[PDB]
Amino acid sequence: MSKVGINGFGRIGRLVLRRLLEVKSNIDVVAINDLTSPKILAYLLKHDSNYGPFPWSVDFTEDSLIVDGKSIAVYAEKEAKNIPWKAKGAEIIVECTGFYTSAEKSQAHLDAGAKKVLISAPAGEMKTIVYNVNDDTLDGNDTIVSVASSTTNCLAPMAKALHDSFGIEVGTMTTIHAYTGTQSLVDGPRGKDLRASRAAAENIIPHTTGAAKAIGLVIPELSGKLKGHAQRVPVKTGSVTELVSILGKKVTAEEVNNALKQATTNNESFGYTDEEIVSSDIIGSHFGSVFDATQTEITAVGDLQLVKTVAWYDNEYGFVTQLIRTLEKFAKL
Amino acid sequence: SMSKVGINGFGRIGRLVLRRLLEVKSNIDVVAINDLTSPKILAYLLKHDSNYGPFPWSVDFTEDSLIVDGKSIAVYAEKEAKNIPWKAKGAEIIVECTGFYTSAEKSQAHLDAGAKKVLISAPAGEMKTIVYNVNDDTLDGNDTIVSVASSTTNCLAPMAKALHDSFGIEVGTMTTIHAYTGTQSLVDGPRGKDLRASRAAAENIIPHTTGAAKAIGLVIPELSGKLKGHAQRVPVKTGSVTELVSILGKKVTAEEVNNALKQATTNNESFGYTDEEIVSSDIIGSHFGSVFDATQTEITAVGDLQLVKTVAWYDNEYGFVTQLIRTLEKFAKL
Amino acid sequence: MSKVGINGFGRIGRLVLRRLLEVKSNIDVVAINDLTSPKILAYLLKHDSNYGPFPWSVDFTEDSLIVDGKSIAVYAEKEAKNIPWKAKGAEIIVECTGFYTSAEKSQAHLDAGAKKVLISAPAGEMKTIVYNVNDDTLDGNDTIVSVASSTTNCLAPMAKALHDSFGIEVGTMTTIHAYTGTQSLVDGPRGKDLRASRAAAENIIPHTTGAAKAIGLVIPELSGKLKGHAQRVPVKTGSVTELVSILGKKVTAEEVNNALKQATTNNESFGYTDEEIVSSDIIGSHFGSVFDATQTEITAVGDLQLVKTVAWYDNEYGFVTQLIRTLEKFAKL
Amino acid sequence: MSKVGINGFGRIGRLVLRRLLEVKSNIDVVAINDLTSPKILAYLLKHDSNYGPFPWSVDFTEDSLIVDGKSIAVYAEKEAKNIPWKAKGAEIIVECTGFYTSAEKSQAHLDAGAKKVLISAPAGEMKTIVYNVNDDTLDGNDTIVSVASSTTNCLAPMAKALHDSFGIEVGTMTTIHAYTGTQSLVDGPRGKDLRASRAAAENIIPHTTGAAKAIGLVIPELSGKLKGHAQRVPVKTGSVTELVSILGKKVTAEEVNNALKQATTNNESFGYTDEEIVSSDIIGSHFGSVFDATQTEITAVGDLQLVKTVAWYDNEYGFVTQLIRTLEKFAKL
Ligand SMILES: NC(=O)c1ccc[n+]([C@@H]2O[C@H](COP(=O)([O-])OP(=O)(O)OC[C@H]3O[C@@H](n4cnc5c(N)ncnc54)[C@H](O)[C@@H]3O)[C@@H](O)[C@H]2O)c1
Ligand SMILES: NC(=O)c1ccc[n+]([C@@H]2O[C@H](COP(=O)([O-])OP(=O)(O)OC[C@H]3O[C@@H](n4cnc5c(N)ncnc54)[C@H](O)[C@@H]3O)[C@@H](O)[C@H]2O)c1
Ligand SMILES: NC(=O)c1ccc[n+]([C@@H]2O[C@H](COP(=O)([O-])OP(=O)(O)OC[C@H]3O[C@@H](n4cnc5c(N)ncnc54)[C@H](O)[C@@H]3O)[C@@H](O)[C@H]2O)c1
Ligand SMILES: NC(=O)c1ccc[n+]([C@@H]2O[C@H](COP(=O)([O-])OP(=O)(O)OC[C@H]3O[C@@H](n4cnc5c(N)ncnc54)[C@H](O)[C@@H]3O)[C@@H](O)[C@H]2O)c1
Ligand SMILES: O=C(OP(=O)(O)O)[C@@H](O)COP(=O)(O)O
Ligand SMILES: O=C[C@H](O)COP(=O)(O)O
Ligand SMILES: O=C[C@H](O)COP(=O)(O)O
Ligand SMILES: O=C[C@H](O)COP(=O)(O)O
Ligand SMILES: [Cl-]
Ligand SMILES: [Cl-]
Ligand SMILES: [Cl-]
Ligand SMILES: [Cl-]
Ligand SMILES: [Cl-]
Ligand SMILES: [Cl-]
Ligand SMILES: [Cl-]
Ligand SMILES: [Cl-]
């Protein structure tokens, strides 16, 4: 129950291991499952187009990685129920494949002899945790838990702060979001999301996301009160979420900013800036969300007020630092 | 009827002004261009376009002109508009596309230089400002200097107008996810006093101020002071999209918003409609100023509190230019 | 008026149809096979990130596309031997999937009832045609033919002219090549080519190509004289091929250029330019190769001389016009 | 000497400071000249699109930056004449504006009271240093010296090693090169050069470079033996140079790679890799040049032999490391 396996050694999977080693975690990654050879997983861990060289040694054998001198078994089981997690005693699986985003599906890791699963994505009605918003809802008896999306991790601490300070009566969100591997390099079939079939680095691409709609799992009072969507655009990582709200009180911009500032104080998960940053400045962030005071906008006509608030997020590494906080707590229950 | 035009600033917008005029076989002839460079360079840029490809007509040049589709066009290189020799070829209406004369005070220099009227391809303060097929009926014979606002305004205005007319907009805020432009930076480095504009445009999402919502009263007077907004500049070369979040004057469904918008786009050469799952590159070369996208419409309601998000695409280069040219053609016949 | 089937309606497959309709070809495309529904293929045909809206109407039914009012059967058979090509009498298959690049594999289209197959890629030791270089080697007995890569179609007309005018003693090629669907959007496994696993829009990526090595299939006398490779870079289409040769004769730049110009005169496949063009200027090219006199370079020391020649190609549409020319001829034999 | 001015606080200028600080140099930057406000230079230093957050604290006043608690004056003089280098005690001027690339032009820095100038670019016929190739050519009487281009620092070490082991009889280079500030963001005039007028992030753009032409200043025996050019491509930083040589001996690939390995052994300026890297893996390199053994290629037809050797380079930071290496030495004579 400090021994971990990773299913899906992709962008998130590899950064999970990077982060665990960065914080000198007591968690022990003993096994990795993907679809490929150790050779290829080794090369991918060693060379990262977004974060540069792996800061530890990486080698491999025909069935393992050796990362900073320590051996990690590598399996290639496309069906999670066949992953031999018991061989090295992997107890908590960090599920990062995208193919097991529900209770029913991730049960397969427990049938395969793990005790717990932390899914790196929304997964329906199950405990969904944004760290430093609702991580106190985790419980010793939880075996399958979600950390939602990157987008949820960015939205939630902002929504929580506005909710606690002013009340959110209704709101809508748009994230301007880096492209991800669910999109396409060249125009071509991508299941049945038509917009996902289009070349991701050459287009602005609207895309659905549940971040707003499922916010009730993280902040129950906001349940049903938000909606939203993304526009996927050609940056490799680093994204930004705008929320437009009718609040429960009349406010000034200074007041909103000051409230947010207070909520980020002593908060390892939720950062604040008033610097004129742009997306690349978020890359490598150790926050799940960085509230940007410079973009706060209050639109007012007589009685009526609309409030736009904006937070940056590194949808890869930043979200990953959240996934790890949640994992470290999950392992100790 | 005024047939003869001068283009000042033969840049992204100015070159496409020519392109579009020839494409529609306008009776308007471009008789002179002014910029800061040589005919050879302007001819190279006209002939080869990174966004729309090869010019569809022949391009050659001489020491002091361009020859385009067989027709000669004078080239001047006067950085101050008052010195442009517009009377040599009888340039009557100036399409002002440099970014440097974005006021009545500034653009009236073209009149001092012998022109009769000026059409500014950008916002230009509190002057007559036209979005074609929203408020072009406010143009008259006494208008001598006119603005066509920003392409962001040409996107926002028709959408806002349809909504104003059908339901009312009590208050709204806009964000445009906007293609990068020449006002931005290639590599991180100073760009006047806007810190964000200093950053590498093709490697960043860059918040950016725009006045499209702020100054919407110039085009739709009843919405004056009711809208704000900003842009997120992103790494696409052209093609942009504008989201507006409104409190409307009436309780609505999405279907009802989409139908109202559809009716407003019917027989409207400036304002298109789509319910297809398009992306920004599908808007490149659009002949509309704005294309409303029914697939992105969103009603968020809790009790009596309702937010409505409406979304419209626009090719901030060519699509905008089609609107500029519609306004120009009308301007010239008043 | 021969009837054609297209296997693989991808970047090349869809542009094959676009080019046939553009030239008002007598060929009728009567069937398409891919892996997806008519609706997704209709979406992709209609909307193209590189070439804009389809110039003809496009609709679909549950088993067909309707393109400019003509019906094209759609099938979804991953094994070519199950494609019912006889149902609409497809007699020439344009093979564009990447999965049948040999005589032995493409035979499966003849087993399934077609008479000939034109493969849109290198396919080993078979007749391999670059139109206007070696198309006269085609005859009434050929049933399986390749058109090589777009790179071969760029390289061969330049090499052929140099060969004919000066002799090429030895040469090496580098193509700075737009990224394609064989690469990856984000860092992730891509078969066994390590470099192909890396984010294509964010890197310069060395990549092997057979264009130089197998050039002898197209220009027998240059067999074994050339090698080369690619650097894949972040442009969506539009590519350029450099060739550094030792020629059989001492030359000037002007002399090299005049010879190429001659070879491009009344040559619908091979253009010339002495304009300072860049890669977006080649997009939509109706040539397989455009020679660029501005980039010619003669480096000489004593009796020694290196000659660099450079030519542009739209690896998508330009190549496709070559493929269609070859197809037009192959259908008349 | 230990007191430096930087004229041109641009991509190179800022990184010069970053690198000095990273190596705990005993050299101290005491003044900076550019064309803007300390506020804007501070924003630029702190927030870097290529290298992320500055690793030391940055603040400013109306006449200064404060970097890691020390004060650095800031001037805004359009003409080097007018810079009070004297005031703050600026001995050596790192000239990084691109506007003073000759001995005569850089004279101003000495007229305004600096003792030496080190120019960050080629600067006509003057002492031009690639560190660990010809820095032994520097003496105490040197006042204005060049470190040439990024491309020169890539080409020179590789060329040097080949020349020492085998002889280069003639060669031509192509660098596939990240776009830089001399190019355009959108299509528009950029002085006389037509190709530089074109949108840099949307195009492959041929472009002249003197690296090969002027190699004689760094490696005198190669004077007039090399030529070359660049293809600028849409990556922000990270480049690669291919050189095709006729050597003075017959060689194998293994033999060429071992000679280069030897030349890179305990060579802090000149690295080696046999890993399958791509450009982004070079970002942040502490080498001026990294020879890539995986791309070596030998084309032999009897006595004739073309040898292609390929080296990577971070045209920003990698080049900067060499610039600082040279500076440290220049400052102690
Ligand atoms: N990229 C982001 O911005 C981001 C942020 C937060 C959460 N997420 C979520 O995390 C998950 C992974 O995202 P990603 O960007 O790392 O995806 P990715 O495509 O980079 O990685 C997926 C990995 O899973 C492997 N894989 C696929 N199917 C498999 C199977 N059946 N068994 C084992 N391995 C399999 C792939 O080979 C790959 O290495 C998704 O659920 C995604 O929604 C992504
Ligand atoms: N690009 C867009 O998306 C877009 C859309 C709508 C409106 N606009 C507006 O249109 C105008 C032009 O935009 P652009 O994108 O074409 O910019 P641009 O930089 O491409 O073009 C400006 C042109 O004007 C020339 N120029 C500069 N100063 C001059 C002077 N004093 N005299 C003569 N010529 C001069 C330049 O040499 C260049 O050719 C701006 O006002 C801009 O806000 C731009
Ligand atoms: N630059 C280019 O894109 C280019 C140029 C010249 C040649 N080629 C060659 O043309 C061929 C296609 O290239 P592309 O870029 O069009 O690739 P692509 O990936 O865009 O297209 C492949 C298409 O084939 C389908 N497909 C995959 N497996 C299949 C199967 N078993 N049966 C039926 N359909 C299947 C896919 O669904 C897809 O639509 C390849 O051999 C490639 O080397 C490509
Ligand atoms: N970027 C590279 O890859 C690279 C590599 C090696 C060498 N170089 C060379 O280094 C030099 C700088 O290149 P860069 O990429 O840093 O350029 P850049 O354009 O990023 O920076 C130049 C800086 O100088 C300033 N400037 C311009 N004229 C000035 C003046 N008269 N006085 C003071 N400041 C002035 C600008 O404001 C800017 O901050 C050039 O000579 C270039 O050839 C560049
Ligand atoms: O909001 C705006 O949108 P456009 O005129 O649509 O491009 C303007 O501020 C920006 O245009 P510009 O940057 O080319 O001047
Ligand atoms: O799920 C989290 C992020 O918002 C991105 O999603 P994706 O990688 O599944 O496309
Ligand atoms: O130039 C050759 C082709 O573009 C490469 O095709 P592929 O990479 O899609 O196989
Ligand atoms: O404006 C300056 C560029 O960033 C410098 O690099 P370059 O001269 O090598 O193009
Ligand atoms: Cl929603
Ligand atoms: Cl004036
Ligand atoms: Cl505003
Ligand atoms: Cl804008
Ligand atoms: Cl088969
Ligand atoms: Cl080869
Ligand atoms: Cl290739
Ligand atoms: Cl040269």
* Count of Cβ atoms closer than 10 Å to residue B87 Cβ: 12
Bridge partners for B203 per DSSP:
none
Helix axes B254-265, B151-166, angle to 10 degrees: 120
Identify the CA nearest to C40 among candidates C6, C74, C82, C88.
Answer: C74
Same domain, B163 and B89: no
Q: How far is CA B275 from CA A199, B46, B261, B278, C46, in A?
A: 20, 34, 11, 8, 14
Q: Is C180 on the interface with A (CB under 8 A)?
A: yes
Non-local CB neighbours of B163 within 8 Å, separated by 6+ positions: B169, B244, B246, B248, B257, B260, B261, B308, B310
The number of residues making up chain A comes to 333
Q: How far is CA B183 from CA A44, A235, B119, B194, B198, in A?
A: 38, 20, 20, 10, 10
Segments of chain A assigned E as strands: 3-7, 28-33, 58-61, 64-67, 70-75, 92-95, 116-119, 144-146, 168-178, 205-207, 226-233, 239-247, 270-273, 289-292, 297-301, 304-313
Q: Is C283 on the interface with B (CB under 8 A)?
A: yes
Show residues of chain A in contact with B300, CB under 8 Å: 170-172, 225-227
Same domain, D179 and D279: yes
Same domain, D78 and D200: no
Here the tokens at position C68 are: 């400019």
3-state DSSP assignment of residue C153? helix
* Partner-chain contact B282 C47, CB within 8 Å: yes
Here the tokens at position B257 are: 């918003």
Q: Are A141 and A127 in contact (CB under 8 A)?
A: no
3-state DSSP assignment of residue D165? helix
Q: How far is CA B104 from CA B56, B145, D164, D202, in A?
A: 35, 7, 69, 36
Rounded Cα distance between B67 and B3, Å, is 19
Same domain, B199 and B112: no
The number of residues making up chain B comes to 334
B323 within domain boundaries? no
C129 within domain boundaries? no
Q: What is the 3-state secondary structure (H, E, C) of A173-218?
A: EEEEEECCCCCECCCCCECECCHHHCECCCCCEEECCCCCCCHHHC
* Chain breaks after residues in chain B, where C lies over 2.5 Å from next N: none
B209 within domain boundaries? yes
Q: Is C164 on the interface with B (CB under 8 A)?
A: no
Q: Is C95 on the interface with A (CB under 8 A)?
A: no
3-state DSSP assignment of residue D274? coil
Segments of chain C assigned E as strands: 3-7, 28-33, 58-60, 64-67, 70-75, 92-95, 116-119, 144-146, 168-178, 205-208, 226-233, 239-247, 270-273, 289-292, 297-301, 304-313
Best mutation site among C149, C154, C180 for ligand 3, i.e. most ligand atoms within 8 A of its Cβ? C180
Q: Which helix (H) or strand (E) holds C13?
A: helix C11-22
Q: How far is CA A129 from CA A289, B74, C176, in A?
A: 14, 67, 46
Rounded Cα distance between A272 and A257, Å, is 9
3-state DSSP assignment of residue A330? helix
Q: Which amino acid is at B303?
A: G
Q: Separation of D13 CA from ligand 4 center, angstroms?
A: 7
The number of residues making up chain D comes to 333
Non-local CB neighbours of C220 within 8 Å, separated by 6+ positions: none
Rounded Cα distance between B119 and B328, Å, is 7
| CB-count burial class (<10 Å; 0-12, 13-18, 19+) for A139 | exposed
Q: Which helix (H) or strand (E) holds B45?
A: helix B39-47
Rounded Cα distance between A70 and A57, Å, is 10
Same domain, A27 and A110: yes
The CA radius of gyration of chain A, in Å to the nearest whole number, is 20
Rounded Cα distance between C171 and C239, Å, is 19
Rounded Cα distance between B107 and B118, Å, is 7
Q: Best residue in C46, C274, C281 to probe B by mutation, most B CBs within 10 Å?
A: C281
3-state DSSP assignment of residue C326? helix
Bridge partners for C246 per DSSP:
C170
Same domain, D114 and D154: no
Q: For D88, phi and psi rounded to 5 degrees?
A: -95, -5
Q: Are B223 and B160 in contact (CB under 8 A)?
A: yes
* Partner-chain contact B189 D11, CB within 8 Å: yes
Q: For D105, phi and psi rounded to 5 degrees?
A: -70, -50
| CB-count burial class (<10 Å; 0-12, 13-18, 19+) for D309 | buried
Atom of ligand 1 nearest to the CA of A15: 16
Structural domain of residue D103, as residue ranges?
Answer: 3-120
Which chains form contacts with chain B, at 3 or more CB pairs under 8 Å?
A, C, D
Here the tokens at position B11 are: 């840049």
3-state DSSP assignment of residue B306? strand
- CA-based nearest residue in chain A for residue C205: A49
Rounded Cα distance between B38 and B40, Å, is 5
Here the tokens at position A190 are: 């991508």
Bridge partners for A289 per DSSP:
A270
Q: How far is CA C184 from CA A181, A184, C198, C263, in A?
A: 9, 9, 6, 38
Q: Separation of A263 CA from ligand 7 center, angstroms?
A: 52
Q: Are A226 and A212 in contact (CB under 8 A)?
A: yes
Q: Are C205 and C196 in contact (CB under 8 A)?
A: yes
DSSP letters along B224-261, please?
TTSEEEEEEEES-SS-EEEEEEEEESS---HHHHHHHH
Q: Is D181 on the interface with B (CB under 8 A)?
A: yes
Here the tokens at position D40 are: 């804007």
CA A123 to chain centre: 12
Q: Are C271 and C285 in contact (CB under 8 A)?
A: yes
Non-local CB neighbours of D285 within 8 Å, separated by 6+ positions: D271, D312, D313, D314, D317, D318, D321
CATH of the domain at C15: 3.40.50.720
Alpha helices in chain D (DSSP H): 11-22, 38-46, 85-88, 107-111, 150-165, 253-264, 317-330
Identify the CA nearest to D320 among candidates D30, D74, D41, D18.
Answer: D18
Rounded Cα distance between D240 and D244, Å, is 13
Residue nearest to atom 14 of ligand 5 (CA): B181
* Partner-chain contact A47 D284, CB within 8 Å: no
CA A231 to chain centre: 17
Identify the CA nearest to D30 among candidates D5, D9, D7, D56.
Answer: D5
DSSP letters along C160-175, please?
HHHHHHH-EEEEEEEE
- Sign of the C-alpha dihedral computed for residues C104, C110, C116 and C119 taken in this order: negative
Same domain, C235 and C105: no
Nearest 10 degrees: CA dihedral of A268, A273, A275, A276? 110
**CA count, 13 A, side-chain hemisphere, C118:** 27
Strands of A144-146's sheet, edge to edge? Answer: A58-61, A64-67, A70-75, A28-33, A3-7, A92-95, A116-119, A144-146
DSSP letters along D53-71, please?
S-SS-EEEETTEEEETTEE
The shortest C-alpha distance from A282 to chain D (Å) reads 8
Question: In chain A, count of helices (H) and strands (E)?
Answer: 6, 16
A309 within domain boundaries? yes
Nearest 10 degrees: CA dihedral of A117, A122, A124, A129? 70
Give the domain-ending residue among B106, B121, B136: B121
What angle (nearest 5°) sits at the alpha carbon of residue D185, between those of residues D179 and D189? 105
Q: For A74, phi and psi rounded to 5 degrees?
A: -125, 120
The number of residues making up chain C comes to 333
Strands C116-119 and C92-95: parallel
Domains contained in chain A, number: 2
Same domain, B86 and B198: no
Measured from CB, residues less than 6 Å from any atom of ligand 6 are A 121, 149-151, 180, 182, 315
* Count of Cβ atoms closer than 10 Å to residue A224 Cβ: 12
CA D62 to chain centre: 31
* Partner-chain contact A176 B281, CB within 8 Å: no
Rounded Cα distance between C273 and B65, Å, is 23
Give the domain-ending residue among C103, C120, C137: C120
D51 within domain boundaries? yes
B139 within domain boundaries? no
Q: Are C261 and D186 in contact (CB under 8 A)?
A: no
Q: Is D236 on the interface with A (CB under 8 A)?
A: no
Atom of ligand 7 nearest to the CA of C98: 10
Give the domain-ending residue among C120, C140, C175: C120
Here the tokens at position B299 are: 């009603």
Atom of ligand 1 nearest to the CA of A9: 39
Q: Are B327 and B136 in contact (CB under 8 A)?
A: yes
C327 within domain boundaries? no
Identify the residue whose tokens are 């717990």: A116
Segments of chain D assigned E as strands: 3-7, 28-33, 58-61, 64-67, 70-75, 92-95, 116-119, 144-146, 168-178, 205-208, 226-233, 239-247, 270-273, 289-292, 297-301, 304-313
Rounded Cα distance between D245 and D267, Å, is 23
Q: Is C278 on the interface with B (CB under 8 A)?
A: yes
Q: Which helix (H) or strand (E) holds B4?
A: strand B4-8
CATH of the domain at C244: 3.30.360.10
* Count of Cβ atoms closer than 10 Å to residue D63 Cβ: 10
Here the tokens at position A66 are: 């050796």
Q: Is C304 on the interface with D (CB under 8 A)?
A: yes
Is the backbone of residue B191 left (phi > 0), alpha (psi -120 to 50) or beta?
A: beta
Q: Which amino acid is at B228?
A: K
Here the tokens at position C203 are: 């890197």
Q: Which amino acid is at D202?
A: E
* Count of Cβ atoms closer than 10 Å to residue B334 Cβ: 12
Show residues of chain C in contact with B49, CB under 8 Å: 280
Bridge partners for B243 per DSSP:
B175, B311
Q: Which amino acid is at D181?
A: G
Q: How far is CA A282 from CA A269, B204, B322, C123, D38, in A?
A: 14, 10, 38, 46, 23
* Partner-chain contact D240 C203, CB within 8 Å: no
Same domain, A155 and A301: yes
CA A195 to chain centre: 22
C102-131 burial, b at 16+ Cβ within 10 Å, e below that, comes to ebebbbbbbebbbebbbbbbbbeebbbbbb
Q: Best residue in A185, A192, A194, A280 to probe C by mutation, most C CBs within 10 Å?
A: A185
Q: Which helix (H) or strand (E) holds B170?
A: strand B169-179
Same domain, A156 and A224: yes
Q: Which ligand neighbours the alpha carbon of C151 most closely?
A: 7
Helix axes D150-165, D253-264, angle to 10 degrees: 120
Rounded Cα distance between D75 and C263, Å, is 59
Same domain, A109 and A154: no
Q: Is C234 in the pocket of ligand 7 (CB under 6 A)?
A: no
Q: How was this structure determined?
A: X-ray
Identify the residue whose tokens are 């790494």: B235
C252 within domain boundaries? yes
What angle (nearest 5°) sits at the alpha carbon of residue B134, between those of residues B133 and B137? 75
**CA count, 13 A, side-chain hemisphere, C285:** 35
- CA-based nearest residue in chain B for residue C234: B202
* Partner-chain contact B53 C281, CB within 8 Å: yes
Q: Are C100 and C108 in contact (CB under 8 A)?
A: yes
Identify the residue whose tokens are 């569809």: B56
Q: Which helix (H) or strand (E) holds A104?
A: helix A103-111
Here the tokens at position C13 are: 């497959």
Here the tokens at position D238 are: 């990270």
Q: For C196, phi and psi rounded to 5 degrees?
A: -70, -15
Non-local CB neighbours of C57 within 8 Å, separated by 6+ positions: C66, C67, C68, C69
Strands A64-67 and A70-75: antiparallel
Identify the residue whose tokens are 């490779």: C229
Strands C297-301 and C270-273: unpaired
| CB-count burial class (<10 Å; 0-12, 13-18, 19+) for D182 | middle
3-state helix, strand, coil in chain B (%, to 5): 30, 30, 40
What angle (nearest 5°) sits at the alpha carbon of residue B314, between those of residues A227 and B44? 145
Rounded Cα distance between C28 and C31, Å, is 9
Q: For A109, phi and psi rounded to 5 degrees?
A: -65, -30
Identify the CA nearest to D18 among candidates D267, D314, D290, D333.
Answer: D314
Rounded Cα distance between D53 and D74, Å, is 21
* Partner-chain contact A43 C194, CB within 8 Å: yes
Q: For B237, phi and psi rounded to 5 degrees?
A: -75, -35
Here the tokens at position A127 are: 């405990």
Same domain, D162 and D308: yes
